[PDB]
Amino acid sequence: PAQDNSRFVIRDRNWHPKALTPDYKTSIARSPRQALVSIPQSISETTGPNFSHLGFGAHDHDLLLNFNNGGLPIGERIIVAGRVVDQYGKPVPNTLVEMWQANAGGRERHKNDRYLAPLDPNFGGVGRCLTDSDGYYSFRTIKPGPYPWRNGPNDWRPAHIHFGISGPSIATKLITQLYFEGDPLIPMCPIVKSIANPEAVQQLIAKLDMNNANPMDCLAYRFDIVLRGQRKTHFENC
Amino acid sequence: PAQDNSRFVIRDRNWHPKALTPDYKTSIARSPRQALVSIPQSISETTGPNFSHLGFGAHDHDLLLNFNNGGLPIGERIIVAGRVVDQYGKPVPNTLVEMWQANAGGRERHKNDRYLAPLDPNFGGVGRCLTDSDGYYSFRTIKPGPYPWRNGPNDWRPAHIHFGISGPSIATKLITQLYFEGDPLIPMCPIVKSIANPEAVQQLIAKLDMNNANPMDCLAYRFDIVLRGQRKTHFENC
Amino acid sequence: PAQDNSRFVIRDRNWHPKALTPDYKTSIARSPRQALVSIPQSISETTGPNFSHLGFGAHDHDLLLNFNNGGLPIGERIIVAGRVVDQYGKPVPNTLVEMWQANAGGRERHKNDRYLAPLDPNFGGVGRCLTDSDGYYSFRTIKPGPYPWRNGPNDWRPAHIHFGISGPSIATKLITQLYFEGDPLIPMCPIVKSIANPEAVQQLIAKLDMNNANPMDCLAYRFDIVLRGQRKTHFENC
Amino acid sequence: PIELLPETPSQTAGPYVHIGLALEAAGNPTRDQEIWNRLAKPDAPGEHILLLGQVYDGNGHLVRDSFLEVWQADANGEYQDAYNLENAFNSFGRTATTFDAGEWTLHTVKPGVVNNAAGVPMAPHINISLFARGINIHLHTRLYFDDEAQANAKCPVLNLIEQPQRRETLIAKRCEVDGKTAYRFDIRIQGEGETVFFDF
Amino acid sequence: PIELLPETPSQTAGPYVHIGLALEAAGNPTRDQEIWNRLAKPDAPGEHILLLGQVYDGNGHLVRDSFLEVWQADANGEYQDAYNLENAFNSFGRTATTFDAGEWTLHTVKPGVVNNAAGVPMAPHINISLFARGINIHLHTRLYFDDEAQANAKCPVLNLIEQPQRRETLIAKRCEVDGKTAYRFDIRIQGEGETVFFDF
Amino acid sequence: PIELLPETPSQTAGPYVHIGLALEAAGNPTRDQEIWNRLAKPDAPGEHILLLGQVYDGNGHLVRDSFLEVWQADANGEYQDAYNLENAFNSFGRTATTFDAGEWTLHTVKPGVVNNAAGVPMAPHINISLFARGINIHLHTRLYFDDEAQANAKCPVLNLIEQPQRRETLIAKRCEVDGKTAYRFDIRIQGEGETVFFDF
Amino acid sequence: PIELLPETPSQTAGPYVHIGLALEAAGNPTRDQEIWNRLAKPDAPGEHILLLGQVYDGNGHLVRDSFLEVWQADANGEYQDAYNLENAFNSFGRTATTFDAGEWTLHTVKPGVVNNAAGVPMAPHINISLFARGINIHLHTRLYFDDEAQANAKCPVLNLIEQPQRRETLIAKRCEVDGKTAYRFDIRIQGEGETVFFDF
Ligand SMILES: [Fe+3]
Ligand SMILES: [Fe+3]
Ligand SMILES: [Fe+3]
Ligand SMILES: [Fe+3]
């Protein structure tokens, strides 16, 4: 079983987006009006699932082959790689990194998405990878395209890949979005602007990695994820 | 017939790229070693073809419908529009604007292109439009993807659309390339870098046009083309 | 009848004042808590009234003569003029510009205004003008004076003239307020501060126009109005 | 990106909006030709109706200084843009709520069906714009009718509102005032039963 | 002061969170091994229960695109971190509400008692994390049981909530779904009867 | 000094210039009306000729991806600017060299004499513009005929080239291809026997 | 973009490159163990060959101060990385051209076939690196054999060179020196018959 031997650095809730951010319309009715109640960390909060024994398929991380109906997806072949570290710079090994995206045209494989851009018969848009001993992950996919959504009359989401990271605990668990370097739609999106600090928006922007690119094949993007810092318990209960 | 009534402003050959630009490898053997011979302008140089009577098809400017094998192309639906003016700011009406590009993945519809990204059965990549009375043109296509080429070991062309503009004369005729705003591959490409002045590279970068975008449908890019200035002949042959 | 041939540039609701601006007390109970629902533009939104055939009186634009009970109004004689253009810089001809203001002392001609500054027996405070072929309007009035109001304990409205502009559609319809150059009360007013961006406050400030002034008679102020950009439809319904 | 000239920012219509836009309602003398609440003359084609309603704030209290502007199609579903006081019908009109009359009135005909950009029929509606003190930028809404239930369930604009309960706020209830066909439309700016406001 | 590397900012899970984290619920084909709502297999020790609930926004409307993650101890009060689909019990599970099923379901056992950092026993609870469109950073809450009134009154976490009326929102009501022991836990994100959310 | 708006910079036409400007040569389907190498129809006035040539780089190797544009006057010495595929003669035409055919061909008539700006007659010529990969900005040149020796010696443009050995590169050699009058014009971009390129 | 640490820039090996890398050829005393031109000992497996050649500059004059390094597979097509002077064969070796001997020599065996990254067989080759005064960054080339014509026509690396005439420069001509099998490989750095140099 799991034990209570770790403490996590408290979240800076002024760095992270606020619950109530009006320009992102759906946040008005889906945000708490009452204050969050602060509780100390215990075994319920400091522990979490370990996915080392989960049965991963051979192409779970490869979106170019995991849907395959007899061909290759249309779109910019890219590699999305990086490292998962904590606030102290310590690597987070054997952690679950999950991802989902749209196709080259901005169409997502869900029944509720009625955007006129067609579906790609060879692309699903789902990926999972377990980080190695040094905290590294890697995905192979196509660069997603932007898409419109009913918020403002002419709001367009920037090209993005949604990320889900587990970490050593439920306290570290995070869902976020990766954006691509130089996309002019980034300073215009109300979901991006939900984050007040401009330096925080930069941590979500994946940088072009020519060094990790496969010549004559595919390009690459680097996206490092920083989770809550883990430290040992000291001077507790006297 | 055509008459000799116009003079064109001399080209600044230090603004335009030079013939010999080593980093773009193929330019080494395909560039003149002897100086260009300067000749005065005559009826042979100051006149050119007018394409007003050319039989344009209904979808010649629409790359989303001009190939059509029973469907829509996969990729970011975009509108590429702008104005064709001369150096004096005077509009160039009834002029031929031609364009060609790759698909969403960087694959071009030619036999010699052996890049592993698949062809889109509903995309051709060819377009033509005649400018209106005010010099405006418009194209509807998908945003092309980058592609690798055998120059350096890891050289990648930025997403681009090739442009061909006729103008009032053969003296104004120009072939160029449009690049997209914020693309991190622009300062790395040796074809782009063939242009020495950084302010000249900016004239080739199409800007995101949210005002010309169709809400819930397609995005838009603005690309203005400036051709050689046209002026009347004065004090010639005394 | 009117036709659906135009599309209007979407409003920047971060440039315009927000609905909830607490310092302007009356806005707390008169602002929607729910988000605005975005709808596409149709014939109902892109069309609007044309007032070319409305019977304008000879002195409708002249506040110095349209009330007249035996003399001239007391106050600084001024000409308020300008141009009504759209976001593309295109003039808006034959449009309706309506205006209302207070007298030289800040007293408005309404029953609910119980401010101790007297009424001017020769001043009404209402004006209307139809823009010419080039989008120009002109009003002859007296400079309004500031007045207090029950908001904060010592709140004073700067000298202003209220403006109502129709435009080509109900989508362009706008009501705003004009302020005067250098007035020290402008940065202290909570109605002006309802606008977050200081560059937006600048557009509401009328500049002294010595060039349009009548020597030995009246001063002049310039106030240009920018309405939503109008563009033709393109690539709609395919 | 491409930046155009910025639009002139909006400001509140103010408490005394009536002195410039609703002269008779302001108890001030009128000019020869005024834009008011009589869109249809007694001899205009279509079903003649009387529209009335009140405007409430977030505390459930009456807004006695509101100014409203309307835009609707005629009985045949056509928008008459050329405003003239000699016409049997005008697509534009103005009304207001005063301290003497906290209820606004509008005399018009029931609008016909008009299509959207995609060619799909919209249910009979009246486009409304609300101005008042405390409202920094005007509120856009639509008025639908309760006796047109079949067309209301198929309207592309009404179906864009996610929750069915909020669609009910745009539906005016049918009644009768002195033998004349009348529809009541109350606007709740804030709170319980808040009216749907649009952006376009 | 000492500043460490900043944590990667949170973003909304989006409306289509189901394509990456709930493939079955998204109507897409599943992979060999999935993380879903079956925490306990029929032959697992402890009292087998069924959990269900609905998620409500501030207008009292159903949130049909919510995604929930649960973390609980077993019947013996121990956290089983080693996730495997061959195990009789797993401490982790995922559930969701779809347009088809606006009610989430979870098949598990009633958790045992676990101590806090100071050795004081906490009442039987299930740790819940709520993700959905409109929710920028996930909401943390706890599910307590109504038939554990004696342990709930002594819980050091539940006693940190100042007002006793707000503690009742964290209490799941006992009921029966198809002759099986069940508990109903409704979450109200905003407004009247708002659920207590935590920060740790 | 007075600076005007700068001209849009040139870029190479690229290796696949054929997909947008020579559809047939690219092995792709053609549109109804195309701009190609047939400048003159069989019933057009003047001496009908066939033009052909090969393009060479600095190593003496064939440029198999070159694209050429031609502009010439008719037999009467007049420039026909109004392009139409119904006309007996068009002053404009496009040709190319492919991997299949490393030799370009052009079907036209021998041009008449045209005067320069000062009224001095120029020898019969064809204005050529060369585009290809590796060529950043297109090369301008002129094609003269060897059987017009008397007019070539007097041409004011040809006499601007300082050295007489460089004028010979602009002269097309008369030959016969399938019992038809033909002229061969080879272009050497770089090196030994380099073709004279112009700037105007 | 992502920037890594920059690589230490290259500088010319200099005129006196021999004092540090070719001690015997520099007429200076050697150390016990030196890396030189004898890759294969007389008893090593495979076909024993003698390689010789001269290096020319752009004016056709001999480069008498060049330094070359070689890397090749053994007779079985395997790269022996563990360098030891006791081995029958070593995959690495060094040679040079001096003022006393303007011709370099190399004693080795003919390399076997090795596959590229894609699993396609490359023709028997020897990887060469050329250093000298005037060469700021070393030149990379490959040596192929004329008696392996069938494999040379199918090599993936040799087929990357566009023009067939330039492929001939990498092909060493077979001859005989004192009853021993020998191949002559001349390197032309610049001009007519310039050797193909690689980048990887
Ligand atoms: Fe006022
Ligand atoms: Fe998304
Ligand atoms: Fe290209
Ligand atoms: Fe040295």
Q: Is B203 on the interface with C (CB under 8 A)?
A: no
Is C97:C137 a contact under the CB 8 Å cutoff?
yes
Three-state DSSP state, A101: strand
Across the interface, whether the CB atoms of C235 and B212 are under 8 A apart is answered no
Three-state DSSP state, C25: helix
User: Which tokens sit at F120?
Assistant: 């001095």
User: Which tokens sit at C121?
Assistant: 């027996």
Please tell me which residue of chain B has the smallest CA distance to F81.
B49
Other Cβ atoms closer than 10 A to C118: 11
Contacts of G165 in chain B (CB under 8 A): none
A126 CB burial (10 A radius; 0-12, 13-18, 19+): buried
Q: Strand A160-165 relative to strand A96-101: parallel, antiparallel, unpaired? A: antiparallel
Other Cβ atoms closer than 10 A to F18: 24
Is A204:A222 a contact under the CB 8 Å cutoff?
no
Centre of ligand 4 from the C-alpha of residue C187, in Å: 72
The alpha-helical segments, DSSP class H, found in chain A are 43-46, 198-201
Contacts of A150 in chain C (CB under 8 A): 38
Is G67:G57 a contact under the CB 8 Å cutoff?
no
CB burial readout G72-104, b (16+ within 10 A) else e: bbbbeeeebeeeeeeeebbbebbbbbbeeeeeb
The CA angle G19-G24-G25, to the nearest 5 degrees, is 75
Experimental method: X-ray
How many whole angstroms separate alpha carbon A232 and alpha carbon E162?
Answer: 30
A52 CB burial (10 A radius; 0-12, 13-18, 19+): middle
Q: Which domains does chain C have, with CATH numbers?
A: 1-238 (2.60.130.10)
Three-state DSSP state, C188: helix
The CA angle F125-F126-F132, to the nearest 5 degrees, is 145
Is A76:A217 a contact under the CB 8 Å cutoff?
no
Tell me which residue of E76, B141, E142, G40 sits closest to A170, measured CA to CA: E142
Q: What are phi and psi of F150, to 5 degrees?
A: -70, -40
Please give the resolution of this entry in Å, rounded to 1 decimal: 2.2
Q: Which residues contact B200 (CB under 8 A, 6 or more apart)?
A: B15, B16, F6, F9
How many whole angstroms separate alpha carbon A203 and alpha carbon A198?
Answer: 9
Tell me which residue of C11, A25, C222, C138 sits closest to D136, measured CA to CA: C11
Is B88:B230 a contact under the CB 8 Å cutoff?
yes
User: Which tokens sit at D73?
Assistant: 């199609």
How many whole angstroms separate alpha carbon E166 and alpha carbon E152?
Answer: 13
How many whole angstroms separate alpha carbon C172 and alpha carbon G5?
Answer: 56
- Residues that constitute the known binding site of G for 3,4-dihydroxybenzoate: 133
CA distances from D37 to D63, D89, D93, D106, D109 (A): 19, 12, 5, 5, 12
Is B157:F15 a contact under the CB 8 Å cutoff?
no
Handedness of CA E59, E64, E67, E71 (dihedral sign): positive
How many whole angstroms separate alpha carbon E27 and alpha carbon D127?
Answer: 40
Q: Which residues contact B195 (CB under 8 A, 6 or more apart)?
A: B15, B16, B17, B201, B204, F9
Question: Mutate which of A27, A150, A156, A188 to disrupt the C interface (most C C-beta within 10 Å)?
Answer: A150
Distance of CA G63 to the CA centre of its chain: 16
The contact set of E with D (CB < 8 A) is 59, 61
Question: Mutate which of E57, E61, E62, E133 to disrupt the D interface (most D C-beta within 10 Å)?
Answer: E61
Candidate from D6, D19, D139 with C-beta closest to C126: D19
> What one-letter code names the amino acid at G103?
E
CB pairs under 8 A between B and F: 264
Q: Identify the bridge partners of residue E182 per DSSP, sorted by sequence position.
A: E50, E175
Read off the DSSP letter of residue C44: H
Question: Mutate which of B100, B169, B234 to disrupt the F interface (most F C-beta within 10 Å)?
Answer: B100
Identify the helix (H) or strand (E) that includes residue C45.
Answer: helix C43-46
How many whole angstroms separate alpha carbon B202 and alpha carbon B224?
Answer: 11
Is A173:A229 a contact under the CB 8 Å cutoff?
no
Tokens 């973009």 identify what position? G1
Q: Strand C126-130 relative to strand C96-101: parallel, antiparallel, unpaired? A: antiparallel
Contacts of A21 in chain E (CB under 8 A): 136
How many whole angstroms separate alpha carbon A199 and alpha carbon A205?
Answer: 10
- Number of helices (H), then strands (E), belonging to chain D: the values are 3, 11
How many whole angstroms separate alpha carbon E84 and alpha carbon E38?
Answer: 12
Residue A54's Cβ-side half-sphere holds a number of Cα atoms within 13 Å equal to: 25
Centre of ligand 4 from the C-alpha of residue G103, in Å: 24
How many whole angstroms separate alpha carbon B64 and alpha carbon B78?
Answer: 10
Other Cβ atoms closer than 10 A to F149: 11
CB pairs under 8 A between B and C: 22
Please measure the distance between the N-terminal and C-terminal CA atoms of chain C and give it in whole angstroms.
25
Distance of CA A20 to the CA centre of its chain: 21
Residue D8's Cβ-side half-sphere holds a number of Cα atoms within 13 Å equal to: 27
CB burial readout B193-214, b (16+ within 10 A) else e: bbbeeeebbebbbbbbbbbbbb
How many whole angstroms separate alpha carbon B138 and alpha carbon B222?
Answer: 9
Q: What are phi and psi of F130, to 5 degrees?
A: -105, 125
CB burial readout D36-70, b (16+ within 10 A) else e: bbebbeeebeeebbbbbbbbbbbeeeebbbbbbbb
Find chains touching chain A: ≥3 CB pairs under 8 Å. Answer: B, C, D, E, G
Other Cβ atoms closer than 10 A to G35: 14
> What one-letter code names the amino acid at C226?
V
Across the interface, whether the CB atoms of A26 and E136 are under 8 A apart is answered no
C218 CB burial (10 A radius; 0-12, 13-18, 19+): middle
Is C42:C169 a contact under the CB 8 Å cutoff?
no
Q: What is the CATH number of the domain that holds D39?
A: 2.60.130.10
User: Which tokens sit at A109?
Assistant: 């494989």
Identify the helix (H) or strand (E) that includes residue C96.
Answer: strand C96-101
Please tell me which residue of chain B has the smallest CA distance to G160.
B150
Q: How many domains are there within chain G?
A: 1
* E133 appears as a binding residue in the annotation: yes
Read off the DSSP letter of residue C137: E
CA torsion D106→D112→D117→D121, rounded to 10°? 130
Centre of ligand 4 from the C-alpha of residue G14, in Å: 6
CB burial readout D75-105, b (16+ within 10 A) else e: bebbbbbebeeeeebbbbbbbbbbeeeeebb
Which protein residues have their CB within 5 A of the ion that is ligand 4? G 14
Across the interface, whether the CB atoms of C98 and D20 are under 8 A apart is answered yes
Three-state DSSP state, G114: coil
DSSP string, chain B: -----EEEPPP-TTTSPPS--TTSGGGTTSS-SSPPEE----HHHH---B-TTS---TTTTBTTTSS-SSSPPSS-EEEEEEEEEETTS-B--S-EEEEEE--TTS--SSTT---SSPP-TT---EEEEE--TTSEEEEEEEPPPPEE-SSSTT-EEPSEEEEEE--SSTTT-EEEEEEETT-TTTTT-TTGGGS--HHHHGGGEEEE-SSS-BTTTBEEEE--EEEPPEEE--STT-
Please tell me which residue of chain A has the smallest CA distance to B117.
A74
CA distances from E74 to A229, E89, E143, E153, G158 (A): 28, 7, 15, 22, 66
SS (H, E, C) B144-181: CCCEECCCCCCCEECCEEEEEECCCCCCCCEEEEEEEC
| Length, in residues, of chain B | 238
Q: Strand A96-101 relative to strand C205-208: parallel, antiparallel, unpaired? A: unpaired
Across the interface, whether the CB atoms of G199 and B150 are under 8 A apart is answered no
**Are chains G and B touching, using the cut-off of 8 Å on CB pairs and a minimum of 3 such pairs?**
yes
How many whole angstroms separate alpha carbon G123 and alpha carbon F96?
Answer: 36
CB burial readout C124-139, b (16+ within 10 A) else e: bbbbbbbbeeebbbbb
Report the gap between the CA of B68 and the closest CA in chain A (Å): 14
User: Which tokens sit at F87?
Assistant: 């006309």
Tokens 């009789």 identify what position? E88
CB pairs under 8 A between B and G: 6
How many whole angstroms separate alpha carbon D104 and alpha carbon D66?
Answer: 9
Q: Identify the bridge partners of residue C83 per DSSP, sorted by sequence position.
A: C136
Q: Which residues contact F194 (CB under 8 A, 6 or more apart)?
A: B32, B33, B34, F166, F169, F188
The contact set of G with B (CB < 8 A) is 1, 160, 199-200
Tokens 């409430």 identify what position? D56
| Length, in residues, of chain G | 200
Residue B111 gets the label, from left (phi > 0), alpha (psi -120 to 50) or beta, of: alpha
Handedness of CA D44, D46, D48, D49 (dihedral sign): negative
Residue C48's Cβ-side half-sphere holds a number of Cα atoms within 13 Å equal to: 23
How many whole angstroms separate alpha carbon B64 and alpha carbon B79?
Answer: 10
Read off the DSSP letter of residue F83: -
Find chains touching chain G: ≥3 CB pairs under 8 Å. Answer: A, B, F
Handedness of CA B120, B124, B126, B128 (dihedral sign): negative
**Are chains B and F touching, using the cut-off of 8 Å on CB pairs and a minimum of 3 such pairs?**
yes
Identify the helix (H) or strand (E) that includes residue F102.
Answer: none
Find chains touching chain D: ≥3 CB pairs under 8 Å. Answer: A, B, C, E
How many whole angstroms separate alpha carbon D184 and alpha carbon D186?
Answer: 7
Three-state DSSP state, A134: coil
Is A36:E194 a contact under the CB 8 Å cutoff?
no
Please tell me which residue of chain B has the smallest CA distance to G161.
B150
Dmax (CA) for chain E in angstroms is 59
Is D98:D28 a contact under the CB 8 Å cutoff?
no
Tell me which residue of C157, C166, C202 sits closest to C182, measured CA to CA: C202
Find chains touching chain B: ≥3 CB pairs under 8 Å. Answer: A, C, D, F, G
How many whole angstroms separate alpha carbon B185 and alpha carbon B192?
Answer: 10
Tokens 């060039």 identify what position? C211
Is A67:A120 a contact under the CB 8 Å cutoff?
no
Other Cβ atoms closer than 10 A to A41: 18
Q: What are phi and psi of D198, to 5 degrees?
A: -105, 165
Note down the domain range covering E150. 1-200
> What one-letter code names the amino acid at C84?
V
CA distances from B100 to A50, B141, B144, E31, F19 (A): 51, 10, 10, 41, 7
Tell me which residue of E46, E192, E66 sits closest to E134, measured CA to CA: E66
Across the interface, whether the CB atoms of G2 and A222 are under 8 A apart is answered yes
Candidate from C36, C60, C233 with C-beta closest to D199: C36
Across the interface, whether the CB atoms of F9 and B16 are under 8 A apart is answered yes
